[PDB]
Ligand binder design. Structure first.
Ligand SMILES: Nc1ncnc2c1ncn2[C@@H]1O[C@H](CSCC[C@H](N)C(=O)O)[C@@H](O)[C@H]1O
Ligand SMILES: [Ca+2]
Ligand code: NA
Ligand code: NA
Length: 375
């Protein structure tokens, strides 16, 4: 607890000493850095290792860094003296592993990335290995943040990142404002955002971390200038269990998006803005949910902009959904989940397509209206 805080401080010192963020940015390059967190994965790790070995010369100062980035083993005695004591502290914290004979250090369940200028530990199981992850991050996380107008954020603006997960959106907002609230209800994400807050030299002085249900924060009396939320939004067929980060509420998975949008006229200060993201079902003309938002244009004079950045036919999602459901619940391979998914997509969701959509909503707009951007 204080030992962990000191360990994260020393980790931060190591990342600074060897220029981690710059090395990550160089490896992935500027045309990929903000596209997706799934850049260093089990399918690219061999190439990452080759770069460290052949272009960075295998320098020992980068050995602990690779343990964190890909899980690659480093011989304990080969670590530089300062990095060796940090490695021991990370093993004690459960953030790296030691081999059974203690002669090397290697990856545990946390992967070190950089996103939007922040250093971030994420759940390594999303990009490596074969066990279902407990903390989500994905391209939807990134595209939510991409559309934020950072130059319009004042130091005194009050911002909230609901359903914060790893903390990425809250930490991004903390680059610009000194008043950030980050919320979640999962034990595992809450422990991780606490680590990532400290990893970026923040504390409760400028970023509050709160265990609180989305609808409780939304009903509350606190008012915000800026809101971000990537909520659970996936609709799974009746009878199937997902995970805390994936399964949306309501008949079509969008209950949490409805909850948020409905309270924006009250929770945002006049002229404040919210950024949401979801993979929205729709027909050939667009996502069904945008039709529900005309009530916010007419009823509350908001401006609402929807940025559609990925389109897939519903049939292309049947496999990924069924695979996720099978793996999350440990179901056997003879269950016809795919037919259940198809039937649900067509009766309940009316989903011909899925549209990965970032939505910007502004209260008290001078130019109210709904705008849907498609390529
Ligand atoms: N009712 C609820 N109230 C608050 N958080 C919730 C919630 N239900 C699920 N969550 C949290 O919602 C998150 C959705 S995943 C989004 C994580 C992060 N904001 C990102 O963009 O990458 C998960 O971390 C999950 O624990
Ligand atoms: Ca590369
Ligand atoms: Na490897
Ligand atoms: Na989500």
């Amino acid at each position: 607890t204080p030992p962990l805080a000191t360990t994260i401080d020393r980790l931060r010192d190591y990342l600074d000493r060897v220029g981690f963020q710059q090395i990550y940015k160089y490896i992935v390059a500027v045309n990929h850095y903000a596209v997706t967190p799934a850049l260093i994965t089990r399918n690219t790790a061999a190439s990452v290792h080759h770069f460290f070995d052949s272009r960075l010369g295998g320098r020992a100062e980068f050995a602990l860094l690779q343990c964190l980035m890909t899980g690659r083993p480093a011989e304990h005695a080969a670590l530089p003296d300062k990095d060796r004591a940090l490695a021991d502290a990370l093993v004690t914290a459960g953030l790296l592993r030691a081999s059974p004979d203690g002669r090397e250090v290697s990856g545990a369940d946390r992967q070190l990335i950089s996103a939007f200028g922040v250093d971030l530990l994420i759940d390594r199981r999303i990009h490596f290995g074969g066990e279902v992850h407990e903390v989500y991050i994905g391209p939807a996380s990134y595209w939510m943040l991409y559309y934020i107008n950072a130059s319009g954020i004042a130091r005194t603006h009050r911002a909230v990142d609901l359903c914060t997960g790893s903390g990425i959106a809250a930490l991004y907002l903390s680059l610009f404002t000194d008043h950030v609230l980050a919320t979640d209800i999962g034990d595992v994400p809450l422990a991780l955002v606490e680590i990532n807050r400290r990893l970026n030299r923040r504390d409760a002085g400028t970023m509050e971390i709160r265990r609180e249900n989305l609808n409780d924060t939304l009903d509350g009396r606190e008012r915000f200038d800026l809101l971000t939320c990537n909520p659970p939004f996936v609709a799974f067929p009746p009878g199937y269990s997902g995970t805390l980060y994936s399964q949306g509420t309501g008949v079509d998975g969008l209950g949490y998006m409805r909850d948020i949008v409905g309270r924006l006229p009250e929770v945002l200060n006049p002229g404040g803005s919210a950024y949401l993201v979801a993979d929205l079902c729709g027909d050939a003309h667009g996502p069904h949910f945008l039709g529900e938002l005309e009530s916010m244009v007419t009823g509350h004079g908001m401006r609402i902009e929807a940025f559609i950045d990925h389109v897939l036919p519903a049939s292309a999602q049947v496999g990924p959904i069924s695979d996720f459901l099978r793996h999350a619940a440990g179901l056997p391979a003879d269950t016809d989940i795919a037919a259940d998914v198809q039937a649900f997509q067509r009766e309940t969701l009316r989903a011909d397509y899925y549209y990965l959509t970032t939505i910007r909503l502004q209260t008290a707009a001078q130019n109210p209206g709904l705008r849907m951007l498609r390529r």
